[model samples]
Target: GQDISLSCGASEPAVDQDKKKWEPDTKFLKTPNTVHAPATYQDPSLLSTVPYMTSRIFTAPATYEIPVKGDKRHMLRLHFYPSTYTGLNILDSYFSVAANDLTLLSNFSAAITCQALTQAYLVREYSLAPSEKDVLSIIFTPSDKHPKAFAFINGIEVIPMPELFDTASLVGFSDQTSDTKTANLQTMFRLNVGGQDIPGSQDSGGLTRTWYNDAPYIFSAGLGVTLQASNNFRIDYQKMPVSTAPADVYKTARSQGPNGDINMKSNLTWMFQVDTNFTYIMRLHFCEFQLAKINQKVFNIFINNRTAQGDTNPADILGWTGGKGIPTYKDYAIYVDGGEEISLQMTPSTFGQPEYYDSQLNGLEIFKIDTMKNLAGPNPKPS
Candidate 1:
């Protein structure tokens, strides 16, 4: 067994001066009348409220000590609050320490530092050994002014570590599509404006454009906020289309033909057109999306006749399809419009699905179509 020793110190020169000055003040030692007063006979019905004051003048000094034994890790914490007043001169100081050794670990010291407050401080160290089963002595010494001090210490046990999961191989489509069965089957793909895989292609005349994919298409058409997921999937698109006239501004998606066809015509279409080009912005949020659990379930989803500036009602433009069984994915979409620039915001809707509760997005694509010259072509522009 091992032994340990702890010691502390304090200073109070100011206390000695105060004691000498108060020696001539006789009433300072007089006990208050309330101390000897009897509670039973002294008009108990009367509410007695008196201030209690205690003063002390130390002739010498004060100190403290502690002892410890055995081997163990320990922590010590201290709190100090000191104050003094000389009529117009007020002073305050607060210092705290939480540490293992005397090296001043995690010390928090704050003082007026101005002409208001002045003070000095110090700390002593203590230690313990495993061979000593008995306790040792700790001592505190006061040199000048004995300012009040508080200290705390405790022993703690170390904990072992746990194993971590390997997530290196979880990347891109492999990881994304791997959980497709359990997770929502709402897949996303993108193409640079002039990229080869652009979903829509130029029509035969090269003037108009048509979507290459089939029904139940969900695609971005304009430039705005985009959606990025934890799995590294992103969908960028512009505002939803809004027009009564036929334009090449649209997004389309179709199933993988007859055999691979889930017959699920569940599609979503968003349209947008710039009227003033005054930087109008909009967003459509989609979330909590699930695919039909049943096979070959035909579902078609789309947006029709949505306008950027008008009294047009959204209910009239919103559209959806019926599913034979629960879709493999549950999705929610939100459409936001109106800003410095014309844009659309698509976010996962949180109403009907739980999976979309935490999914938030602020992204989309900007699809621009030159309708001015195409529509204002010739007086006899053929249909």
Candidate 2:
């Protein structure tokens, strides 16, 4: 929790303002609504974790700037518990959120996302880089085009974390700039394959990156199971920053086969339902923990049959990062067709087959690339 740089409940004070001595500087912000609404949990599953965050909030179109100074990237957590607040249903609530000029959420659906478990709060964490700016500006604006549309937020938390990929690895990528890429990137799914469901806070080294298990009915993962680490110690692979991929990933992973599981067509495939026609950022995390040496396992990644990773080795990246559990990531942008279930297929390179065979992934993250097409609102900076 030391990494929890910012935590504040919206509208109301935290739990008991003076009682909770942990965060005295708990900064809370919101615009005026008709009256204050103290709500109860519709789903009681998460009362223990985020009991204080169940209150209802309504904010006017304004910006609340949180001061952050550093060259590092941070995570923006917008938590919500959608339900009948103050005897009124606000499922029709609609709004847009922006960090500076970046549109984090546009017409976001809180009801559908939290409909399964009303009390089980949902948090969307975006990787944010303030660059040289001393403050990270967050603005919530209401989109009046929809019925009962307004700006609503439950709690806000900003935490310090490492950047996704550095300039060296981003030679041919989308939204190459620090601000533009962060602005356009909207999270679609971040999954932990072949493993049990992981809490959002537990995954990604307490950075609050929510990595759901592949078993969710929304995702299409077939006949596959998990592959766990047999060795006692964690792997020392290096492709990303030290804190990005924590021990949870290196401990276990999902593989089509320990050696071979390609059904002739021979590609480990998973399909995800996502917003069609938007450019997507696909990132794969790998740590050759299973195979100790280089070239032991080589695979090619395919997104809708297109080569995302052609003949790749985790060992090379691991050795590059000084042979530690520090994982490395591969990122590239692909345009999803007017199609459902953005498909991902991983195959052992045919060119390196037999001796050069096997496909494995520790973690996966997919983000919908959103832009400022109709970005008409307040402070629509050069984002």
Candidate 3:
């Protein structure tokens, strides 16, 4: 696999929280201008300071030519910590990023986006189709919208991946699917719903994708019960490849409690801020360990307040996968409007009249498909 990890401005090699080695980008750069964040500006959200503490600043357009196999798909990850960079103000940093001829980001502002999300740092993940060229040219250009604006990056990663996209079910349309195989995708969220955070090193199939815990994204107090698969039970991947998700993700789940009254009272929901006007594919993972009989547990699914899977034909893990500890995933494609927020809600199916009034989700992933080869979006307003 073509795996490249670079710590933008550090002189020495650094190891991330996942124990992945990141070499300095000095050799790939010429006449580099690097900056360090002061201790006062350091954020506790960072799991490691090696890369996030250092940044390679660009006053003008610059490109880094990285060598790769050139015949396979690659996952490009950009890490940014928008802190005070020596002589530059965080507010004055805005830029455009491109890989080869494809635009990954345009007029992107990490500081403002972080402020809007109340996050200390941000990471953008993009899937690049095979270019058939040996060198992956990553270009970063400072925006001219503001005087003295500059571009900066703290870390970069390029990892080879298998063909991960094929088709997605179109939401609100009957028997229609979107062909996602030929298009690029930006990973908006990859979550291990009820489980602990799984770093890249622990990812199955060596995808080097980190699955974060979903606790921070839960909406309100509908905090359902978390269940762990018994140690004796083995997760049967069945028809799906292990690359889809690690076994650890399927080992735990979030579900409405066993009480029928409480389960029917509220919906288990999670919300995420996303780019507007883009169609998103939400992949929901499910594995039933508690009950194996059909109609034991069933629920209605909603995306952005719209019925994704209606109560009339609800989501049934045992009914879909047919057995306990068997994993399955469903994809729902929906378009986001100007609201710039996506909500995923699951409510017990009262109409289905299932034996148990509850819903269960093992993991979830959301990706934004590129439109017209552009994945850029406007900078969110700082709160």
Candidate 4:
């Protein structure tokens, strides 16, 4: 068999088969009913009506009860048409969910129209896996502008998970002005779980993540300010108690008195500590005041004991006084590199009165950013 000249691998098959037949398995899944409706008609010409002409917005709600019992995932599809005469600029729009009457869960805003729109469409799909007795409510609203036209909301559908079957749907609408309607809409969806009809918890988890609501640390100085101790930190500020120091130290440059010629150290010093590498955004809110006879000059804010200040200049700071004059409650923000140690100092050129108010500091908030990840997701990236 060693050298036999037999070739068996170089031939094509004589049969060509492309199609096959199999039975459809209709065992586990249920079919969903397809429902469609024409757009609801409200008077576009009615914009001239006394009540309709006012700048207001309309949001309709469609509620559905969960048919299948137990824990299940539900998909809600909402469809609506933007009004032809949305006079007010519609910045953003989105749906909201609520349980009971108190707690509300809101989705992020979806950009609708720029200045105004005669026609637009807003369709949002949300997935929720409910547990126990829960009532779900949905509402829609404009972003920055007030709503001022007729809006038609239709095609509300709720489908159960896994089996993919329709649960329920409805059509309803309401209208309100920007002043009359609260930005937040409240609605509830009720469900039965584990054979028990329990009311849903209204504690929507959206607001907890906002930067303005919860701040990690706050820094401030002035009278009537309270400093609390957390973990291993303690801080206190004392009033101007008489102390033995060079007389010139207290005299500012503008003062003509004997102490004026002498150089002086600041009467206040603030100190803090950091143990880990982090980034901080520092904001200073202060008010300006007039001194004896000297005109107010722009002041500078310094950090890390360095005289060469950051790009932020005194003029860049918010002025309580209109034109370079002294006023109260100015606000400014700067990023501070973290890790080792940090300290801040304020210097004034000609001081009869400090640019900031005497007894109050506006506010300071610090946030930790993970530079390794995307710093800005949807918003423009900071330079």
Candidate 5:
């Protein structure tokens, strides 16, 4: 199916200077389209929020349909601006969001997320990879157990994609070994390792991924620890090129550099909470931007005191990306359970003779995988 990019609130096609465009989702799920517009606010408060997007669709218990040709993965980005719009308290907007039969968000509160992050607007992205064969229906059902609950959205987008990533595939891997008892994947964290907080739109590179800051949740030991500048770099896919990730990962890094080494004495560690007895996929993004030559820095990484990468060198990874500062990522399958926390600790490795014994990280994206037990047929493991 061809990709569909449509603004839910606007009646005209909107395009940015760089050619990113969105046609109006003129077809409504409800009769005549329940679109609302404020008297003012002509422009978006943030660049991520497109201009002329003051219109929104409201549902007492309905869906705003976006037609799609399915059987492959599709990216759906739902834009939201949490506010007291049209005398509606967004805090009471509790509803079950769905992608066809899959329940995406249950009783989600946009107000809670906006207030917690102190953000005026946000975009919730989901992969409608596994949906009704023909249409990617975004159903919003008001919760009967809650009060003053409904669903609303400012914009929506659907991008056609290869059958490479499916959120459903990451469901149900709650342990190293599991034949039964599945758990739903929950996003534990997506932190920027060494740079300032990057807006989701800026870092997404059209993928619509969100990344937060890691400075507040990390503990490090060493000298001359500095934040890596958030700058774009090159890429060379070592094994096979992956389309799911974006090039925006190449920029920014968190390093203990310009001074000491990352040995046993000065190690870097980050601990994050997760659901008990759950299997998670840890995505680590890196790029050798500061160094000019190969093997200038090298180290080893440990997760939960277990070896993850021995002889960890960005030069080898850089070489894979064609001897340049091309950003790449490594995915680690880890199981953290029994109310225990997951940790990522890095130290200098003796495996390689490097100019400096240090380690660094650009970003981290961690998410739980759902166990696929209790369903029909044997499913392959999600990569």
Candidate 6:
């Protein structure tokens, strides 16, 4: 019924900057073994000291059996900060995490994963369906492939949420639809295009999902101009629910600047590292606050160098939704092949003689869909 946050190695309950209470992991574990962060090591990304600075270390298989509420979908998050633990090397930390029958991580290495992403910490979010037993069991098993391997975790979060998926059209096979309603998913990215980072506490309706700034993902120098909703206009979410995306995401956007000459020559693109051989769903959020008339601004969306969501015609915000300031989203599913990255490009469209020659994107989310009841991917190599 309520959200649960567990802080590993914490002797007593602690509250974070957002005033969210975090319970100690002692009560949830049979053996309260843990370690504190090394004083010499420092990382700028480690913002929360309560969770990131302390972690529960495991030498063998372990499980945290947490009681859950009614049968509904729940969002599970695992926080990790790979640092030197007492008597254990950070490189030795390799393990797999599983929730009941669903495999969340296989042969995962927090140290290597953080290195590849050039981040000091990692957080994996998953959407899981409720089990029949009414208890959520998260098991961590050390990897047998590495000698003296171990497992550790810094924090855990569980929040029950309403069903948020239905179906997604396959990118190539338009005739086929993937059943995302009952499938498990792993969140790869959630960005608020052209806006500052939004903390989880500020999330609308207590969803507690963090929205990151999309500046770092912009491809090279193609960084377009950022625009915000006019003070005279207010965003209306009557067409789409507030839970789809917060109002902050719809209020700001990244668009090709006012220079039509440059807009016609370049496309707003963002690149991301992804695993191969897995299906991913891209959810693009749209809101037209500047232009109210149809075809005033039109654009084409491309994923992996192939046109998406615009095979027949370019995307028009005012044409898709009735009027300006109305927010909506479109989902497209595609499978990565022979590549370790995915690129999303938006180019201005000249079709229908649009008034403005620019492309805009308000928000974006990428998720890895479960294949054969597994969402596990290979560990990224150190950069």
Maximum-lDDT candidate = 3
How does candidate 4 fare on TM-score?
A: 0.24
Give Cα distance to truth, residue 57, candidate 4, Å: 45
Which ranges in model 3 have alpha carbons more than 4 Å from their true place? 30-41, 350-353
Off by over 4 Å in 6: 30-44, 174-176, 230-233
Candidate 1 TM-score to native = 0.17
TM-scores, each model vs. reference? 0.17, 0.76, 0.92, 0.24, 0.71, 0.93
Over the stretch 1-383, how does candidate 4's per-residue lDDT look in tens digits? 01011011112111112111111111111222212222233445332221111111334442333233335444444434433323322233444433223222243232342112223343333333443444334333222232432222333334443321121111011111112011111111111100121111111121111111111122323212222122232111122111111111111111111121121233112333432343333333232222322233334344455432223323222243342222222212222444334444443333334333222222222222223321211211122
The pairs that clash in candidate 3 are none
**Candidate 2 Cα lDDT to native:** 0.57
Candidate 6, 1-383: lDDT as tens digits:
68888987777788877767899876666444434333236577677776777787877888888878747888899989888777678988889999888889988989999888888898899988756667888888899998889888988888888777778877776467777877688999999998889898878757789999999999847799998986556778884668788888888899988987799898789998888888898989889888879988888888888778565578898888898889988888889975878889988887778888899999999998888778888888875
10 residues in a row with least lDDT, candidate 3: 31-40
> Model 3, 1-383: lDDT tens per residue?
94788888787987877788898877775445544243237798898896788888888888888887777888999999998777678888889999888888898999899988888999999988888899888899999887778899998888888887788888877568888876688999999989999888889878888998899999959789899976667999877889989998999999888788988888899999898989999999999987979988889998988888874778899989989988989989999884799999998887767888988899999999888878998988875
* Total backbone collisions for each predicted model: 96, 8, 0, 17, 12, 0
Q: Between which residue pairs do clashes occur in model 2? A: 43-119, 236-323, 236-324, 236-325, 237-324, 239-328, 240-327, 240-328
lDDT of all predictions: 0.20, 0.57, 0.86, 0.26, 0.59, 0.83
lDDT of 3 at 83: 89
Best to worst by lDDT, what's the order? 3, 6, 5, 2, 4, 1
TM-score of 3: 0.92
Model 5: lDDT to the true structure: 0.59
Worst 10 residues of 4 by lDDT: 1-10
What lDDT tens digits, residue by residue, belong to model 1 across residues 128-159?
11213232121112212325422221111111
The list of candidate 1 runs beyond 4 A from truth reads 1-290, 293-319, 324-340, 355-383
Per-residue lDDT for 271-320 in model 5, tens only? 87555565676777777766766666666767777766763432244443
TM-score of 5: 0.71
